[PDB]
Write a protein of this length. Structure first.
Lengths: 216, 216, 216
């Protein structure tokens, strides 16, 4: 039913203890990063948040992060999900700690929710109370500060973003207009933590409203 | 059966009477445009034509217009369809008039047609007799002049475009090679109205030919 | 079962004996190329290899080559497959010879293989012993030299590329990170022919390993 959590899952994972020199150059890895952890999951935004959480729980940084066209439900294989994260580290131990943190946060952390009882529409309104290096890489987001991670289908997202910015003391840090590779739209809002929560609640109310009466 | 109209439908709609300042800046809205109408439908090109028709029937202009990867049949939700149009206006009344025009033209206007009796292949060959601001935004298209809107799968489209340019007194204004986000290919042809109709008929004949015997 | 060949098929084909002048200009065709062969198939990489083989078997060159978003299984129509190749030639005879070579190599040539018995995961590890103009267009690849064509889902591909570069005397010529329009990842490796075969075998072993135990 509406507001129930969609539980994402890790679909594939591997650790490259020592990345090949040639491939390392093509990947433009810093000198210190010669160990690489690969992970794929069926939910892109939840995974992006987990990767960022990983850069707080270990000596890792995101080397690569991209989502798939049309999402997991139209993926080329079960191992693909709709994302691939490559975490880089100085050694296999740090990489595994990072990956462990990613697994924990993909299975029991930030999660999309059903916008309706029909369960054909999904959205994400999540507060990252303390951003790590990854999310703070984005222009407008400072390392350690909080943020609201808002994701929804094109129209729900546009309406909801406007509705969030009017509900709390927050600023638009990054706006990803529709479509993303997955055909969703996304926004990263900044400000106080309590304010970000507020924004998330207003976002949710907007998406649910459209879910109930999509055409007024 | 072949040549039957595919009837598209509006999947979601909303009006933002007064857009948030911050969001307005990120959207780069002109000073006069502070009211915003959002609409999503299951057919991208038909919707693009409706939006353009709207800029003739009201004091609106298209702020944003983009289609989804792999189309409506592989959309993330029923409200997404495969397009989102954001119409901008000076006030909610103009925006609603624009949206009303969009609805009318999405339900009873330009429409794709089945290329075969199997109904697994679709195309669009439509004459926009008088283009509005939106379509005329495209390089080569003058405000008010006519044009042929041709859309078909990669090969059908390439063959048909060539076939249209040989059938009537027309020029290639814009060519969108495959794939578009929806995996179709498209062309906007220019010239006299009667000539555009001619181009549409030759386009159709080419697509049907391939539909009957795809491999000669 | 695992390692069985996926047999691709041509989905649509046509020859334009004499391309329209206007369209020819928009396509930026060289003066000598005024005949054009169009072909679409359900497998993009196999088709890219066939097109390249065609530039060896006839006086043709690839005018256009692009794949579709989310692949054949989520294509807009059966004629679309997931690729469109436009071969350009000086006359219809050369174009038809090129197309004949493309058909033969799409039906009985380079072919993806199932990574698992479930047959939900596919990969490509193929040695092009003598590259033609098309593949050698890519920076790092010399006309006539050999190469390994490696393709797999995001994680399988990353792991396998690293694994290939460690298995044989080869260099990374081109790396296409995930996702491609089809949501796969790809690599073109260079070096001796025997070495390329080696790389293909190590690639395959890596993809199969992940297929058996995707999460270690």
């Amino acid at each position: 039913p509406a507001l129930d959590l969609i539980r994402p899952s890790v679909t594939a994972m591997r650790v490259i203890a020592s990345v090949n020199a040639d491939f390392a150059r093509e990947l433009k890895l810093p000198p210190h990063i010669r160990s690489l952890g690969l992970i794929s999951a069926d939910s892109d935004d939840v995974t992006y948040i987990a990767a960022d959480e990983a850069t707080k729980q270990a000596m890792v940084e995101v080397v690569y992060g991209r989502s798939l066209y049309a999402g997991a439900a139209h993926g080329p294989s079960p191992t693909a999900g709709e994302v691939l994260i490559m975490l880089g580290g100085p050694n296999p131990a740090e990489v595994r700690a990072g990956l462990d943190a990613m697994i924990a946060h993909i299975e029991n952390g930030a999660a999309f929710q059903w916008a309706n009882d029909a369960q054909d529409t999904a959205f994400l309104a999540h507060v990252v109370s303390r951003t790590g290096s990854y999310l703070s890489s984005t222009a407008g987001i400072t390392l350690g500060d909080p943020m609201a991670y808002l994701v929804a289908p094109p129209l729900e997202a546009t309406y909801g973003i406007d509705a969030a910015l009017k509900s709390a003391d927050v600023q638009l840090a990054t706006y990803v207009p529709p479509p993303s590779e997955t055909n969703y739209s996304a926004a990263f809002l900044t400000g106080s933590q309590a304010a970000c929560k507020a924004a998330c609640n207003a976002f949710t109310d907007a998406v649910l409203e459209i879910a109930r009466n999509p055409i007024q």
